Amino acid sequence: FKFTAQQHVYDINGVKVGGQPGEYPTVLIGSIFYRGHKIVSDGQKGIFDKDAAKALLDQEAELSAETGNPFIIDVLGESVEALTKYVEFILENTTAPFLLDSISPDVRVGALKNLGKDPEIQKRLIYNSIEEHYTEEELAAIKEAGLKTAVILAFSKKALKPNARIDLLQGKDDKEGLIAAAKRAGIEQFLVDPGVLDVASNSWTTEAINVVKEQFGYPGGCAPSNAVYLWKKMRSKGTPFFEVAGAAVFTYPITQGADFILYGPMMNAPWVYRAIATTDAMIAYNNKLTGVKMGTTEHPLLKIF
Amino acid sequence: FKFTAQQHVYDINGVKVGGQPGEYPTVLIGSIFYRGHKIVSDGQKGIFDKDAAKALLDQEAELSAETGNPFIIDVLGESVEALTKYVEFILENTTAPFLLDSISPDVRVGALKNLGKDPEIQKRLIYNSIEEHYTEEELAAIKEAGLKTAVILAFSKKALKPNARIDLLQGKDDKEGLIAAAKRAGIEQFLVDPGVLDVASNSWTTEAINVVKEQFGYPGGCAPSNAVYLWKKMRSKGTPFFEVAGAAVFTYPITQGADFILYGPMMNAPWVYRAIATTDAMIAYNNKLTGVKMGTTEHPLLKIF
Numbered sequence: 314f315k316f317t318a319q320q321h322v323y324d325i326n327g328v329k330v331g332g333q334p335g336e337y338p339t340v341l342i343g344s345i346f347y348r349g350h351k352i353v354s355d356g357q358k359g360i361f362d363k364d365a366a367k368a369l370l371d372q373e374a375e376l377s378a379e380t381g382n383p384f385i386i387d388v389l390g391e392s393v394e395a396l397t398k399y400v401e402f403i404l405e406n407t408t409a410p411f412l413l414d415s416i417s418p419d420v421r422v423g424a425l426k427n428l429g430k431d432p433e434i435q436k437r438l439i440y441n442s443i444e445e446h447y448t449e450e451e452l453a454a455i456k457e458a459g460l461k462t463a464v465i466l467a468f469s470k471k472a473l474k475p476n477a478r479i480d481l482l483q484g485k486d487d488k489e490g491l492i493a494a495a496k497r498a499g500i501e502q503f504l505v506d507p508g509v510l511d512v513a514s515n516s517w518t519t520e521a522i523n524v525v526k527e528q529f530g531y532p533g534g535c536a537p538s539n540a541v542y543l544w545k546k547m548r549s550k551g552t553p554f555f556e557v558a559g560a561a562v563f564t565y566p567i568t569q570g571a572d573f574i575l576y577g578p579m580m581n582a583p584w585v586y587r588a589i590a591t592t593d594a595m596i597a598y599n600n601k602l603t604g605v606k607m608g609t610t611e612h613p614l615l616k617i618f
Numbered sequence: 619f620k621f622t623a624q625q626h627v628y629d630i631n632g633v634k635v636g637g638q639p640g641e642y643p644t645v646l647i648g649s650i651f652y653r654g655h656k657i658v659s660d661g662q663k664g665i666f667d668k669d670a671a672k673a674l675l676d677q678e679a680e681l682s683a684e685t686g687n688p689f690i691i692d693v694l695g696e697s698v699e700a701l702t703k704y705v706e707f708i709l710e711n712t713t714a715p716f717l718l719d720s721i722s723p724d725v726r727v728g729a730l731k732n733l734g735k736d737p738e739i740q741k742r743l744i745y746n747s748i749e750e751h752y753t754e755e756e757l758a759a760i761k762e763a764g765l766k767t768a769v770i771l772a773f774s775k776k777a778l779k780p781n782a783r784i785d786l787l788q789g790k791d792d793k794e795g796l797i798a799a800a801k802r803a804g805i806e807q808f809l810v811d812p813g814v815l816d817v818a819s820n821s822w823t824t825e826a827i828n829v830v831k832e833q834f835g836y837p838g839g840c841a842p843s844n845a846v847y848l849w850k851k852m853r854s855k856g857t858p859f860f861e862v863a864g865a866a867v868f869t870y871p872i873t874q875g876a877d878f879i880l881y882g883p884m885m886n887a888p889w890v891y892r893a894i895a896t897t898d899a900m901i902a903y904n905n906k907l908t909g910v911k912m913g914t915t916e917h918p919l920l921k922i923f
C-alpha cells in the first residue's frame with residue numbers, strides 16, 4: 314500500500330525520517346536517564362555513570378551500523394539541572410539527534426534556557442513534545458532556542474478515535490491546531506506521535522498514523538514502551554517471553570507504515586533492533602511488486618541476511 | 619484490514635479458523651515428529667517418547683487456554699509406518715485437529731490408506747497438502763478417506779510472485795489449479811498456504827494471502843519456520859535475538875489479516891503464543907473501526923492483560 318499525500322522526509326543531522334512504506338528504515342528512539350534508570354544515582358543533580366552512558370550510545374551506533382536503522386536518543390530528565398547536564402553529555406558523546414524530554418514542561422523549558430540558541434541545538438535537538446496542554450511560555454522557550462523540529466503529540470484523553478487527529482493537528486472551532494502552535498514557535502518539521510494509551514490501543518495509534526501520512530504526509534510514529542512495561546503479566550515471565558511480546562508491540566506500527574518508534578530503555582536495543590530490522594526488510598521486499606524505490610542502500614533488507 | 623469477499627469460517631473439530639481480521643484469534647500450528655525431532659528414537663518405524671510427546675501436547679493445551687489461540691497439530695512423518703503410528707497417537711492423546719504432513723506424497727497417501735474410513739479422521743485430519751505435484755491416485759485416496767479439509771499449498775519455484783501463486787490456486791491455461799483439484803477429491807474447506815520462499819519474501823506470501831481473502835474468502839496462512847531456521851546470520855546471534863526475529867516473521871502475516879501460522883517445532887510454542895496473542899489483541903481492538911464483531915469470547919484481547 315502507498316499513501317496519497319507526498320510524504321515529508323526530514324533530514325535531521327543526517328537521520329532520514331518519513332517516506333512511503335519501505336522507502337526508509339524505521340528510526341529507533343531509545344530512552345536514557347528515564348525514571349529509575351540504574352545509571353543515574355541522583356536525578357535532581359544529574360549524577361550519572363558516564364562510562365555506562367557512553368557504552369549505551371556506542372552499542373546504539375553499533376546496532377544501527379549492523380541493521381541500517383538510524384537512531385535518535387530520547388533524553389529524559391526530572392530537573393533542569395539534570396536534563397541540562399544529560400544534554401551536554403549527549404551532544405559530546407554521540408552524533409545523533411535527540412529528544413529533549415521530561416514529564417514536566419518546566420524542566421524542558423529551563424533546560425532550553427540553559428542550552429541557548431546554539432546552532433547545534435537547532436540541528437540536533439527535537440522538542441518532545443508539543444501536546445494538547447502546551448503553554449505560551451513553552452512556545453516562547455522553543456522559539457528563543459531557535460528549534461526547528463518537534464514531536465507533535467497528537468493525543469487527547471478526550472479524543473481517542475484516529476480521525477480526531479485531523480482535529481488536534483489542524484485545529485477545530487476556537488482551538489488552535491498543534492501544527493499551528495508549533496509553527497508559531499518557529500518549528501518547521503513535525504514528527505507526529507498520536508500517543509499510546511495501552512498495548513491493545515496501539516492499533517488505534519497506528520490507524521491515526523495512517524490517517525496522518527495519507528492526508529498530510531508528516532512522518533508518523535509512537536511510543537508503546539510505557540504500555541509494555543506496565544504489562545507485568547508478560548514482563549515477569551522473563552526471557553524470551555517479554556522480548557517477543559515487546560517485539561510484537563513495537564513492530565506492529567511499522568507493519569502499517571509508521572516511520573519511527575520510541576522503544577523505551579536503550580538496554581533493550583539489542584533485541585529491538587533485530588526485531589524491527591526484520592519487519593523493515595519484509596516491507597521493503599514488498600517494494601519489488603509496488604515500484605517504491607528504497608531511498609537509501611543502508612536498509613535492513615540489504616544488510617541483515 | 620477488512621477484506622472484500624465474504625469470508626469462510628470453518629469449524630474443524632471445535633477449532634474456528636478464518637474470518638475478517640479480529641473476528642477469530644489466530645490458529646497456531648506446531649510441528650511434532652519433524653526431521654531431527656529428538657523425542658523420536660526411530661523415524662522409520664515411528665518410535666518416540668510418548669510421555670515427552672504428551673507433555674508437548676499438554677503444554678499446547680495450556681498455552682491455548684492462556685491466550686485463546688486455538689491449535690492444530692502439524693504431524694510429520696518420513697515413512698508410512700511412522701506417520702500412521704503418529705496419527706494414531708495424536709488421535710488418542712489430544713482432541714485437536716491435525717495436519718497429515720509429509721514431504722513425500724507416497725507417505726501421506728500410504729498413511730491415509732492405513733486409516734480407512736473413519737468419521738473421526740474426516741473431522742480431525744487435514745490433508746497437508748494439495749500441491750503442484752498432485753496425482754489422481756492422491757485425489758482418489760483423499761476421496762476414499764472422505765476428507766473434507768485440506769491445506770492448499772501454492773509453494774512453487776515456478777510461481778514466485780503473489781499473482782502467480784493465485785494462478786496456481788485458481789487455475790490458468792491448461793491447468794485446473796489446486797482448489798479445483800481439491801474439490802475433485804471431495805474437499806470442501808480450503809486452508810490456503812502460499813508457501814514461504816525465504817524470510818524477506820514473507821511479505822509476498824502475505825500479499826498472496828491478502829488476494830486469497832480479498833477474492834475467495836478462504837482462510838489463509840503460512841509456515842515461515844524453515845525460512846527462519848535457515849537464516850544463519852540471525853540464528854547465530856542466539857537467544858533472544860533469534861526468537862524476536864522469528865516473532866517479527868510469524869506475526870507479520872497476522873498484522874496483514876492472515877488466519878493461521880504453522881510456527882515450526884512445538885517446543886517454540888511458549889514464545890510463539892505470547893507474540894501472536896499480542897498481535898491478535900491489537901488487531902481485535904480495531905474491530906469497531908472495521909465493522910467486525912468478535913466471533914468468540916475466547917480471544918487474546920480479553921485474556922492476556
Ligand SMILES: C[C@H]1CNc2nc(N)[nH]c(=O)c2N1
Pocket residue numbers: 441442464466506508509535536539575
Ligand atoms: C508517557 C508519555 C510521555 N511522553 C510521551 N512522548 C511521546 N513522544 N509519546 C508518548 O506517547 C508519550 N507518552
Ligand SMILES: C[C@H]1CNc2nc(N)[nH]c(=O)c2N1
Pocket residue numbers: 721746747769771773811813814840841880
Ligand atoms: C517444504 C514444504 C513442505 N510442506 C509444507 N506445508 C505447508 N503447509 N506449508 C509449507 O510451507 C510447506 N513447505
Ligand code: NA
Pocket residue numbers: 333334335336337338339571572
Ligand atoms: Na520505513
Ligand code: NA
Pocket residue numbers: 773812813814815841
Ligand atoms: Na514453504
